[PDB]
């Protein structure tokens, strides 16, 4: 009823509607990178009290329609250690004690994995702390080869 | 046999390949008693080993 | 190993991780004489501002 000079309508003449601050922009924000929540199975199976909550989310990666074929194949090849036996991508976090923070962290992890799986021209940072010995062992195993014919 | 690979009993071990009654060099004429099975080391486990007992 | 455990043993692949024992810390006294400010963070559970009755 009361309004002064510093009112909400006078400072912004373009925004004077009664529902301009509650209109959900669903029709102009429905891209493929939204991650549908109806096909995700988020469950909480930990209540520690070292107070940290666990938020495990899994979904069938082989039946995801919001993901293209090449990016799905790439993210399945480069992350073949986190795939369950039934084709379930189990991703969990253990940072905060709240379930909302863990869910947001899992969503951010999924988003960065998706945005890095599609980008194939990615410069890999050459590390020398744990892969050098692996490369040395692989080279030494490949060096001891000097036969002529073997099948099987 | 694999000295490292048994998940249940720590002191025991598993069996992979076993032969018997090998006519000298003929390693293809003797009877079979245990089908060959490739090693299956765990992920977080260390470095397993398999010895050929002849 | 995944394919072996899948189409050779009819089970799931077990995973492990080389864990380490927790570090040693003396008994937290009431008045830590001559100790840095980070002495309370050594025994702190979570690094978040907790609130009780508020």
């Amino acid at each position: 009823e009361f309004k002064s000079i510093y009112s909400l309508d006078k400072l912004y003449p373009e925004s004077q509607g009664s529902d301009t601050a509650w209109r959900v922009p669903n029709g102009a924000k429905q891209a493929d990178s939204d991650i549908p929540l109806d096909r995700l199975t988020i469950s909480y199976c930990r209540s520690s009290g070292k107070v940290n909550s666990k938020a495990e989310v899994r979904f069938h990666l082989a039946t995801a329609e919001w993901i293209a074929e090449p990016v799905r194949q790439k993210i399945a090849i480069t992350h073949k250690n986190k795939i369950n036996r039934l084709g379930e991508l189990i991703l969990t976090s253990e940072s905060s004690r709240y379930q909302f923070r863990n869910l947001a962290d899992c969503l951010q992890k999924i988003r960065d994995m998706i945005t890095e799986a599609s980008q194939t021209p990615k410069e890999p940072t050459k590390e020398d702390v744990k892969l050098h010995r692996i490369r040395i062992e692989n080279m030494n195993r490949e060096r001891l080869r000097q036969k002529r014919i073997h099948s099987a | 046999t694999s000295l490292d690979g048994h998940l249940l009993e720590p002191d025991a071990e598993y069996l992979h390949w076993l032969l018997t009654n090998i006519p000298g060099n003929r390693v293809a004429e003797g009877q079979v008693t245990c089908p060959y099975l490739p090693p299956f080391p765990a992920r977080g486990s260390g470095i397993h080993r398999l010895a050929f007992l002849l | 190993v995944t394919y072996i455990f899948h189409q050779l043993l009819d089970m799931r692949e077990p995973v492990f991780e080389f864990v380490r024992p927790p570090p040693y810390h003396p008994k937290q006294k009431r008045f830590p004489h001559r100790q840095p400010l980070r002495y309370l963070d050594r025994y702190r559970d979570s690094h978040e501002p907790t609130y009780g009755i508020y």
């Binding site: - | 490292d4 998940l7 249940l8 765990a42 260390g46 470095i47 080993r49 | 009819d10 089970m11 077990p14």
Partner: peptide, 24 residues
């Protein structure tokens, strides 16, 4: 249940050439 799932939570290794192969 599968009887072959006897994994146990603790797994030991009886190989002396193991700790130095993992840089631990």
């Amino acid at each position: 249940p599968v009887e072959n799932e006897a994994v146990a939570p603790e797994f030991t290794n009886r190989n002396p050439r193991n700790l130095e192969l993992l840089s631990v």
